[PDB]
Design a binder for this molecule. Sequence first.
Ligand SMILES: O=P(O)(O)OC[C@@H](O)[C@@H](O)c1cnc[nH]1
Ligand SMILES: O=P(O)(O)OC[C@@H](O)[C@@H](O)c1cnc[nH]1
Ligand SMILES: O=P(O)(O)OC[C@@H](O)[C@@H](O)c1cnc[nH]1
Ligand SMILES: O=P(O)(O)OC[C@@H](O)[C@@H](O)c1cnc[nH]1
Ligand SMILES: O=P(O)(O)OC[C@@H](O)[C@@H](O)c1cnc[nH]1
Ligand SMILES: O=P(O)(O)OC[C@@H](O)[C@@H](O)c1cnc[nH]1
Ligand SMILES: [Mn+2]
Ligand SMILES: [Mn+2]
Ligand SMILES: [Mn+2]
Ligand SMILES: [Mn+2]
Ligand SMILES: [Mn+2]
Ligand SMILES: [Mn+2]
Ligand SMILES: [Mn+2]
Ligand SMILES: [Mn+2]
Ligand SMILES: [Mn+2]
Ligand SMILES: [Mn+2]
Ligand SMILES: [Mn+2]
Ligand SMILES: [Mn+2]
Ligand SMILES: [Mn+2]
Ligand SMILES: [Mn+2]
Lengths: 191, 191, 191, 191, 191, 191
Amino acid sequence: SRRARIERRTRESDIVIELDLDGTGQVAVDTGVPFYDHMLTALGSHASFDLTVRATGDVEIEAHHTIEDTAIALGTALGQALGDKRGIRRFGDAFIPMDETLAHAAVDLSGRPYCVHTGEPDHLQHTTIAGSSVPYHTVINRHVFESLAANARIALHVRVLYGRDPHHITEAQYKAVARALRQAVEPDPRV
Amino acid sequence: SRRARIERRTRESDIVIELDLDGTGQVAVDTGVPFYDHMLTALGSHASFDLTVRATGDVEIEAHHTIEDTAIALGTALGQALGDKRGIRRFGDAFIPMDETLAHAAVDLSGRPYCVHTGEPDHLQHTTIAGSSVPYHTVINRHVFESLAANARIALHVRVLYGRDPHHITEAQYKAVARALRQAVEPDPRV
Amino acid sequence: SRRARIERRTRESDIVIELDLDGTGQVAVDTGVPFYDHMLTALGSHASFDLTVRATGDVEIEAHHTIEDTAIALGTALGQALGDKRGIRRFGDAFIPMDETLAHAAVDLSGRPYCVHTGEPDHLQHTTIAGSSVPYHTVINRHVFESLAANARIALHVRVLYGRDPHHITEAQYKAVARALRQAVEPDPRV
Amino acid sequence: SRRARIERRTRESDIVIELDLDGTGQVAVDTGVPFYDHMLTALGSHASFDLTVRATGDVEIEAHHTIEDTAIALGTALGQALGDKRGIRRFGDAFIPMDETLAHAAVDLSGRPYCVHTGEPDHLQHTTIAGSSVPYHTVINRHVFESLAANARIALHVRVLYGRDPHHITEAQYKAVARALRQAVEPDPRV
Amino acid sequence: SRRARIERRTRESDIVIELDLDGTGQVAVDTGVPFYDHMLTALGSHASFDLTVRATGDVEIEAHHTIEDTAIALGTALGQALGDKRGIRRFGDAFIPMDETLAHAAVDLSGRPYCVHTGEPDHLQHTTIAGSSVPYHTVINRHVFESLAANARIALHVRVLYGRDPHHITEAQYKAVARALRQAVEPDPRV
Amino acid sequence: SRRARIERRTRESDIVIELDLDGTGQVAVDTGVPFYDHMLTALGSHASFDLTVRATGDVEIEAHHTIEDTAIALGTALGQALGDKRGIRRFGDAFIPMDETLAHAAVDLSGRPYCVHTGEPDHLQHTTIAGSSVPYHTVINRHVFESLAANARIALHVRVLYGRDPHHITEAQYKAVARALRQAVEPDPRV
Ligand SMILES: O=P(O)(O)OC[C@@H](O)[C@@H](O)c1cnc[nH]1
Ligand SMILES: O=P(O)(O)OC[C@@H](O)[C@@H](O)c1cnc[nH]1
Ligand SMILES: O=P(O)(O)OC[C@@H](O)[C@@H](O)c1cnc[nH]1
Ligand SMILES: O=P(O)(O)OC[C@@H](O)[C@@H](O)c1cnc[nH]1
Ligand SMILES: O=P(O)(O)OC[C@@H](O)[C@@H](O)c1cnc[nH]1
Ligand SMILES: O=P(O)(O)OC[C@@H](O)[C@@H](O)c1cnc[nH]1
Ligand SMILES: [Mn+2]
Ligand SMILES: [Mn+2]
Ligand SMILES: [Mn+2]
Ligand SMILES: [Mn+2]
Ligand SMILES: [Mn+2]
Ligand SMILES: [Mn+2]
Ligand SMILES: [Mn+2]
Ligand SMILES: [Mn+2]
Ligand SMILES: [Mn+2]
Ligand SMILES: [Mn+2]
Ligand SMILES: [Mn+2]
Ligand SMILES: [Mn+2]
Ligand SMILES: [Mn+2]
Ligand SMILES: [Mn+2]
């Protein structure tokens, strides 16, 4: 009903997105960038989407291109699956506490494409989250939310009220966008 | 059931308000102040009210008196239609992104009359929104929310988190009050 | 179903808590600290809990010990009654206007124990709310929210956006925690 | 062996102190000032003294005189019970965390009478801890430590590294003095 | 006598902790995060615990989850092994110089769960300690001490008085917690 | 058992040190610099060393050379007497109140040579302590602690928390190093 399959094949990467807005958190994400996988799994789960994301890109250079193309593809999927947007809440927002962190997101689904990202501590502009694989530079967080908003054609405002740990600060934001989405996407029993 | 008809006839103006709290956004507003009409149409629509507003006043002087009397009348209608206020959510709030702007409103419907309006950029104290008709001075925004809160006898807190365009800044606030209202006015399945 | 009875007997005090998460605001609180009684009655009521709190302690010293033990016991009750936490909203938040005051609370019920309390004016660190009985020092507000979060094992973020009156500032916070709780505790029709 | 009984009868008050340095925390304190009782019970207990304090004074005026005379008497008892001070550690110190508070105390038992009290937040100069009885003004904390040091004829340095709650800030200090005392008073197996 | 075995199996990780408070520094730690292994080996050794820690987690994402779960499990073990806490010193503290660094830790074992971490230079919020394996982001230090304190249900105050090298700054803190623990955990010959 | 005899013959001075770590404060110090004698007598006594120091140098120039050579020799003695350092506490620290002054010292005996000296008031960089004999310039305090740490091959951190009198400020530091030493040097019943 509200589903979309998006294939995005660029020089730098290969993306397949399968999205059902009216899901139960059946989410599977593999991008070659494990922390990104973790963030997108949280987003799909907490938005109660069913979501598959398969992506392979030029991670030898760094995660940037793959992360960006994936977000673009995902935003495109979101718009398509939304369709005419009639009968929905339209607006949604959510606060996410995560230990010391508090993040917030608000959305207007029928609003024009726009992203405002504020409150993220300055050290996240040069912070790396690294494991045994391809690392994630948190400076990309903004890029993701902008790409997503621009291709879903929605208004997305993401705020960090405060926080210290970069993992918490980032996950809380992704989760906040997710629940904001979940709320806004739901059928509105009055309109 | 939760309806009210208010007629307010002063030296400066003539107002008729017809309000149904449990509506579907059937809204018709004509005050002689087209931007005000636009704001009140948004308020009624996004609050899921059914709302008629017919007003004629001394617009040769400026919109102030008509805008004020209308808000007073509308607040009075809101209180009357609310009645004993039993069984309702009581509290409501809403975030409204509008391009670069983010506005918020929170309400307590059984709280004592009170309005706090904060965060609006200083240039809105002397900004005019002008078209082919009677203009709207944004400095009035505050006046409207205060008049509304005082006559509905509710607690109304309106915030602009940030914003640049005066049209966006104002509409986002009106819309925020609307959805806050809509939430608070709804029947609460537990109380 | 989601109920708990907690008895907490220390050197300083004696506490009995009876808690039903799925209640209708049937609340009875007696701690020897009337303003605390007032705050906890508001918390239980606005959270739509059914709640009994009977407590006797060393109020000759001051309210601190009794207030603290009670909050610990109450948090313990909340955790127990929550049980495995499956099927619930998990996240909740609420804004509470109270005349000039605006307070907010956000919760993550499956999050790790954590409390962040911010925005409370400095004069509440040495303010007393006094009547004909045992007085309440508002500096304790923080202590209460921390104790509650630590023993329910949840993430609790409480904010005062602004305010002047200490009674309003405190009640608005207690009420905000209550509605945040109420939301987060509710069954989620999708998970 | 290291015991002392002190009776101090002034215009303002009546004090009896019974002190055994080599005790097990058998402590009983009654001054008419319940919070003071609580602080002195903690001091005796954590210092592993056996301690009886019976005091009646002019509490209609306020606790000051009684609190002061008691501390003087207690310091006098400490000196007497110490006697020639041979064979002891002489020096002692202790850190006391108490939730958000951290306090410290260091002592030189054979040093000349001296007290330095630092780091206590400014609002404790006008803070009251009040219950159902005679209240305790925290501004007195300093007075107590000075009186104690002057009459035991020792060097006593009390610090608050940080803290917020006045009950915690005060109790942590009393407890810190207690454990510092306990350490310094102990027989030194080398001297 | 004072031992505990804790198994903690989450989505993100698998932890087994074996803890004897009354040990001789027989410590074996393997978490997949070699620097963490180094820190926990120092903690167990300097606390004179006997300690086994076996942990496997989602280090492809980064060390965070594994580090956190391990600390939670370890804190839980500490509490269990502590049992009723009767007859012990209760309080402990230790200074650790490490070349240019000076760190301190103080504990109250019967105090309520609480952690205050202060004095760590700002560049440790975005510093990485990297070798041939999974890296360690020092921003996590705080997270570890908080998790540990919350699950052992103790008061833990960790301070860096000063320091420059992140390895020294971190190890000195872990070692300080260890010796503070060791002291506080010991049988008290007077209580 | 843990003893050392050091003879240090330079152009500027002649030093003989006899050191027993496991002593009873049998101390005799003669350097031609009476205040230095006083400081070293305090150090040996409060460290419970047995210590003989005989030194003659070029005091016509000033005390510097003799004070320095003596400290070097003493540090060398400390290291030698320490030997393999097995079975000892390793870490030690001590607070020394002295009227208005509070000083602290912490040591790591198996740590690499390092000295950090902080908190000493600026006027001690040009202060003289003078009597009927060769004077002592307090600026040398630092030099002494550095020389001592470098030749004993230990980590020595000396702090003045506060103080006014240069005699007190200096003696408190020497005494603090002494008790820190005494603690760290003692046999550890667990390692
Ligand atoms: O909190 P959640 O259960 O949604 O997620 C698991 C959580 O343990 C993990 O994502 C995380 C916790 N702290 C940083 N990352
Ligand atoms: O965004 P809405 O569809 O609620 O409203 C129409 C919108 O295009 C218009 O009100 C507006 C857009 N920017 C300023 N004003
Ligand atoms: O506002 P409520 O009806 O939830 O509560 C009664 C209210 O009148 C009282 O609690 C109060 C009003 N101002 C300070 N305290
Ligand atoms: O922490 P202790 O057990 O020494 O003391 C009891 C404690 O619960 C009480 O004195 C207190 C706790 N917070 C303020 N006062
Ligand atoms: O100082 P210890 O012997 O406890 O630890 C060995 C030490 O050489 C090593 O842990 C280290 C030294 N500097 C940074 N790390
Ligand atoms: O305080 P002690 O007994 O360790 O030392 C004697 C003391 O009287 C003397 O060293 C001194 C006192 N004030 C400055 N110097
Ligand atoms: Mn890009
Ligand atoms: Mn907000
Ligand atoms: Mn995570
Ligand atoms: Mn007007
Ligand atoms: Mn418009
Ligand atoms: Mn407390
Ligand atoms: Mn009230
Ligand atoms: Mn006095
Ligand atoms: Mn207390
Ligand atoms: Mn975490
Ligand atoms: Mn210190
Ligand atoms: Mn190391
Ligand atoms: Mn030199
Ligand atoms: Mn002297």
